[PDB]
Design a protein around this ligand. Structure first.
Ligand SMILES: *C(=O)[C@H]([C@@H](C)O)[C@H]1C[C@@H](SCC/N=C/N)C(C(=O)O)=N1
Ligand SMILES: [Br-]
Ligand SMILES: [Br-]
Lengths: 244, 244
């Protein structure tokens, strides 16, 4: 069949959870994409904490981050996410979406180099207008689910214009789930500063013989629904028999 | 701050499964080890498919293996393990203990360089006597649970005398389980050619703030019990509160 194909049956998974949004899949072997909503699939939003993927890559490649063991000391300002009020390395910072650590990265990266790198990566609208340390939260950067997949595919194949090492370390840091059936490398996000408020989940499922890339976003009025990002993606993956 | 400590309560986990063997833990933070049996902990056996860890490292470092995507074509000889009668890369070869792929690696590595490398790694008794392509199954190499942990600790810290790249690729290939509580990187083994028949499981549990290295072996008269390697290790890890 075609390059892209709408499967509106996935909408039953959003309906079940009184939710709206898109899941995009890309079967790497067949070079075919699938989504419940071709229009929303190409709607650009603030990347929010999904920006931690390219931010990590740029920080590692410029030596702002030496490796996944280097400790970034809590600045001692109590914030409302308990897990942020502690020291972190790249693995825990990505795992717990520790914004303050990445703001520090962004400040040392600086706007000139952040800009070159987002152009080299062909990342979303490639726009860093706003604060060099908050533009992925309330500045000019925008990216669609299908633009996330394009970026992730370059990362998986070690094709981005950064070292092989930087790509391996970030792919390591993205580790989220693994068993005898599959591996998930992914990153969550919650955009709240500009409407509409959305939750992100972008990454890929490794199997023995194939890779399935995915990017989903959904309306997130309150944080009560953040667990639906993974739950709804996993309902789609199961319906398509990509995971048991 | 005693270096090694016998905890005989773990024996109840082998007893419940009508089994005998050892689990060795090493808390990296505290530099303290724990085992159910100090004597068996230091008893050397054939590494069997646990040899795939150093074998992988040596193959990658010498360019016998270019990367984790390179395909090793089935030689077309039907063997007793279904999953071996198919093409493999490093990830699937490690996952399915595909002996024939690693025999091919060993033949290209050659005994001179295999020997230098095991000495550089301080790997068990450092003895490759027997067939260059079967010595880890029925030749002279022997290694204890505590010698496994020594080796694995060098791998984790990227300290072996091979490239950082080789160590990262193998640590990637070792991925076995991951969730939001822990990550397990490990390799299984079943020694059957020389008595006594034993099952191995060696690797480590990554947490947010610590690493717990582990090596267990157990009597494996038949293959019916191979699943006890992980089940018994996990009962110990749970008892010690290393995993929920
Ligand atoms: C990134 O998009 C977010 C930033 C803009 O605040 C952070 C916030 C977390 S939501 C976790 C809420 N639960 C608290 N324990 C997040 C994410 O989910 O990706 N990234
Ligand atoms: Br990895
Ligand atoms: Br590297």
């Amino acid at each position: 069949g075609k390059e892209w194909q709408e499967n509106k049956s996935w909408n039953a998974h959003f309906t079940e959870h009184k939710s709206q949004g898109v899941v995009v899949l890309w079967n790497e072997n067949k070079q075919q994409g699938f989504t419940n909503n071709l229009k929303r699939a190409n709607q650009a939003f603030l990347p929010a904490s999904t920006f931690k993927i390219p931010n990590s890559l740029i920080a590692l490649d410029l030596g702002v981050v030496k490796d996944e063991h280097q400790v970034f000391k809590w600045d001692g300002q109590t914030r409302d996410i308990a897990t942020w009020n502690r020291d972190h390395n790249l693995i825990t910072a990505m795992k717990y979406s520790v914004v303050p650590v990445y703001q520090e990265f962004a400040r040392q990266i600086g706007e000139a180099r952040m800009s070159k790198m987002l152009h080299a990566f062909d990342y979303g609208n490639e726009d860093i207008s706003g604060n060099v340390d908050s533009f992925w939260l309330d500045g000019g950067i925008r990216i669609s689910a299908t633009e996330q997949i394009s970026f992730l595919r370059k990362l998986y194949h070690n094709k981005l214009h950064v070292s092989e090492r930087s790509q391996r370390i970030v792919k390591q840091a993205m580790l989220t789930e693994a068993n005898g059936d599959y591996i998930i490398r992914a990153k969550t996000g919650y955009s709240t500063r500009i409407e509409p408020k959305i939750g992100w989940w972008v990454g890929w499922v490794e199997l023995d013989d194939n890779v399935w890339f995915f990017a989903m976003n959904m309306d997130m009025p309150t944080s009560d629904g953040l667990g639906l990002r993974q739950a709804i993606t996993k309902e789609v993956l199961k319906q398509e028999k990509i995971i048991p």
